[PDB]
Ligand binder design. Structure first.
Ligand SMILES: O=C(O)C[C@H](NC(=O)c1cc(F)cc2[nH]cnc12)c1ccc(Br)cc1
Length: 167
């Protein structure tokens, strides 16, 4: 039993809700919140900008120190950093950004990072400003992640769609 409330169950291990991931993280304090990161950990907009803003820019400060020490992530890669006031940990995962021409097949590699964590609160990788089809992203998520994933979808319209077209 865990503290996630109000999710529709899609599979044995994938759950989905219409929620603002920032507000959901602040209320659940999950062990792991996933950020839709880029390789530079520059959290300017989308989910990343919103999560970072909710940390009063502490996520960005920590991220800049990480990059200065380690260099950029790989597309499809991840790193674990602090969750600040939102979660114990933040798993920064780099999905491919279609608006940069990155190979969508890297989306499966990106979701594989979730399997290193028993339970996660997560956005749909490569959705939103990353330009991928959120329905394809949901399919890859379901077919790749084996751990328990609670997907928050900010847009109510999108959500209702994802549910009605799910197989
Ligand atoms: O709806 C989703 O969950 C996926 C994606 N979300 C974002 O891009 C997004 C951006 C942001 F700045 C803050 C956020 N907090 C939660 N998600 C976001 C999206 C896709 C299509 C459309 Br139309 C609208 C949104």
């Amino acid at each position: 039993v865990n503290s996630f409330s109000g999710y529709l169950k899609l599979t044995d291990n994938v759950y989905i809700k219409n929620a603002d991931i920032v507000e959901e993280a602040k209320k659940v304090k999950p062990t792991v919140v996933v950020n839709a990161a880029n390789v530079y950990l520059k959290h300017g907009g989308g989910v990343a900008g919103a999560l970072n803003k909710a940390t009063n820019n502490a996520m960005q400060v920590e991220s800049d120190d990480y990059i200065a020490t380690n260099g950029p992530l790989k597309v499809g890669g991840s790193c674990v950093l602090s969750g600040h006031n939102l979660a114990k940990h933040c798993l920064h995962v780099v999905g491919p950004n279609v608006n940069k021409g990155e190979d969508i097949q890297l989306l499966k590699s990106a979701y594989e990072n979730f399997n290193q964590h028993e339970v996660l609160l997560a956005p749909l990788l490569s959705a939103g400003i990353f330009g991928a089809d959120p329905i394809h992203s949901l399919r890859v998520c379901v077919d790749t992640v084996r751990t328990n994933v609670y997907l928050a979808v900010f847009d109510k319209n999108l959500y209702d769609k994802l549910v009605s077209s799910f197989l």
